[PDB]
Amino acid sequence: DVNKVHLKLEGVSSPEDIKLIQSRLESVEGVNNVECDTAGQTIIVAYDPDVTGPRLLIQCIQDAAQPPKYFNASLYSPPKQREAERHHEIRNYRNQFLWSCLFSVPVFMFSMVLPMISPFGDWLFYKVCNNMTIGMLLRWLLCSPVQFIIGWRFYVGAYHALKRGYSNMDVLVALGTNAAYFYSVYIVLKALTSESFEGQDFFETSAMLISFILLGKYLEVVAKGKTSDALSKLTELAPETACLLTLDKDGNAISETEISTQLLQRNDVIKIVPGEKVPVDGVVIKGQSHVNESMITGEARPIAKKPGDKVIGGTVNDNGCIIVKVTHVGSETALSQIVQLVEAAQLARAPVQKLADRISRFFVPTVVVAAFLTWLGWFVAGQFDIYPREWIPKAMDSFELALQFGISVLVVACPCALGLATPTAVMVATGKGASQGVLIKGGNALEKAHKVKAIIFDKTGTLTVGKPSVVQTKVFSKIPLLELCDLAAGAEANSEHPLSKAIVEYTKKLREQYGSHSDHIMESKDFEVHPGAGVSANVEGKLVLVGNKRLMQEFEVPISSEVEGHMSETEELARTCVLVAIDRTICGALSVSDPLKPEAGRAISYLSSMGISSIMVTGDNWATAKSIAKEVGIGTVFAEIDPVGKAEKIKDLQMKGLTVAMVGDGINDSPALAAADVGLAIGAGTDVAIEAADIVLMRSSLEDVITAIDLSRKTLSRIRLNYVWALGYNVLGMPVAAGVLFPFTGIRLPPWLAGACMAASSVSVVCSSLLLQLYKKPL
């Protein structure tokens, strides 16, 4: 996408379009730089949003035409083109597989199956000349398509790679596929050279090996493609709906109209009726409206949009009429910002890949030299005839068997678990993370999180909720709860502050608990603005004095023994409380508690049994944190500790060698994440979670953590198995068909068979690394 909209003009390459636009640009204002457009392909003049953009510039380009018909321009730039490009990649590899299969399969078929039932095998044996038959010729002819045409990638893979050295997969693939066919050419040349020469040849090896390697490559890339668009859900909140509320000079009204994102630039106002999808990243000017959204968190946020509030684009209005002006472009659109994260999802670097490539530099030259030694062994042995010669297979002698066991090693070479398995597993892990709502921004984090048995936690929406919920009214003198809600609302109706707003939240809460409007709401009399001890008010004719015991003494309200009882109850768990005196007589208290993130019973009391130890170092006061620890599990607790203390303690704990992680969201909580090995964020309300972080989660429910860590460990399960499998199947079966051993104990294995022996250990590896797909969260 570009800020110079790529608009192709009406009239199929008609220059007068450009001439008229040039005249208009000389006429109209607002352009940053009026420059040539004939040299460019579209309107390539310099401009930017806000001062100009969709509305004004579309109007100008349209009006460039002779009135009333206009050069109708809306927008033309890649809306979402990754899908098409990746689908073309899939089609390319699909086409390569299709061609490579069609020629290869008959080639394998000819000298494998036909001799068994051979009414046609004699036709193959029908000699063209002195030992050069029809079958051999046709098989040779149908071999250039395989390596000389289709497999050229391998060559271009190796061409520069071996030009200086240090090798890779390409080297072994190239040598193994080339040697068999190239020696097969020589053997058939010597076959045609005489009439007493013996047959046997090897073409099927190369075709089969190339086909299977290409199939593996196809599976790898298609899995990359599938997991790449598995981000899906994240950016598909794409709104095209819009409105234009044309206003007069005083902004009263001119005309409301339905439009699209065609003309949406900044300073564009939209009316959002209920149900209608919100336009691209607007902000409310005036109007109170309930609207729900869920963008950087997964547990949803309902907000009563006041006259001025961030109404995120692509969301759902519940109820209300609001004027929504566009004031954001580019990255400030949350969709775009988290698309920089799906772009960051395309950014990763496996640390295990380092060890993989280090192994790759020890394997290939060593295996080549070990294979080479075999030919010298058999050759020196056969030249100086110092061993018996009566088990030599018929129609053969020295130069056959020597080079045959020589070639029989570069076809049994196993590595496909060093080139395919690890990238595939790493990518599928990220795909599953995105599936469950995790953005693992780097394989480094995935590898690091494998070995952790202790984590850090924090308040402020990581183990808590927002403003605390009122939980306990003791009702000293009998006043109905809903009547208390009405009285509290009437008293709070003046001087609205977040704690008083929380009192009104308790009001509302008990209202949905009861159901239905009650009595009447009376605005406060004798109102005194003082939240230091509680405000003075008169509601329903009753002197509602909401305020602590200090206020009860201030306004001379009777004190009962239940006052001291509830004081003791408050000091038990450090609720933070306030007294409500109706008619200047205390009618119960209004105790408030801050709810935690309430799944700890299932989550933290049980992941510890799975093998972690909860370390809770946090900012809230000593009493609050010790009570939180007293609620459920968690061991050592360090309260009254500012984010700095979290930083030092985590530093020493990681230095001791436990790789302790932290779970916490907030600007102040950020350095703790930065200094720590890996981070982990439930919800992305803080911007630093979108910034440098490791295991950013879509939702805010901490259950994800379980689903996170096990998954990582589970990944490093399968990978290790593959590193065993090779270090299994590779060296206990390679020396079988590697010569050197065989002058003591016989029994054959033919060179062609290893072609379908590397094959099995080149697909099952991918199957093991792909079975990561089927997975479920434990609890």
Residue numbers in the entry: 184 to 962
The authors write:
Copper transporting P-type ATPase proteins are key regulators of cellular copper and are found in all kingdoms of life. This protein is localized to the tonoplasts of roots, and is involved in root-to-shoot translocation and grain accumulation of copper.
We also studied the effect of no such supplementation to HMA4, which has previously yielded an early E1 state of AfCopA26. These various conditions yielded four structures, determined at overall resolutions of 3.3 (HMA4BeF), 3.2 (HMA4AlF), 3.6 (HMA4apo), and 3.7 Å (HMA4Cu). In comparison to available structural information on P1B-1-ATPases, HMA4apo/Cu are most alike the early inward-open E1 structure of AfCopA (RMSD 4.1 and 3.8 Å), while HMA4AlF/HMA4BeF are most reminiscent of the outward-facing structure of LpCopA captured using AlF4- (RMSD 1.8 and 1.7 Å). Collectively, these observations suggest the HMA4BeF/HMA4AlF structures represent early E2 conformations linked to copper release, likely E2P, while the HMA4apo/HMA4Cu rather represent early E1 states associated with copper uptake. This configuration is stabilized by Y912, N913 (M5) and S945 (M6). In HMA4apo these amino acids interact tightly with the sidechains of the central cysteines, with C597 being wedged in-between Y912 and N913, and with a strong interhelical cryo-EM density feature in-between C599 and S945. In line with this, the available experimental data indicate absence of the feature at the MB’ platform when copper is not available, such as in our HMA4apo/HMA4BeF/HMA4AlF, all XtATP7B and the apo hATP7B (PDB-ID 7XUN33) structures. C Close-view of the A-domain-MBD−1 interaction in the E1 state (HMA4apo).
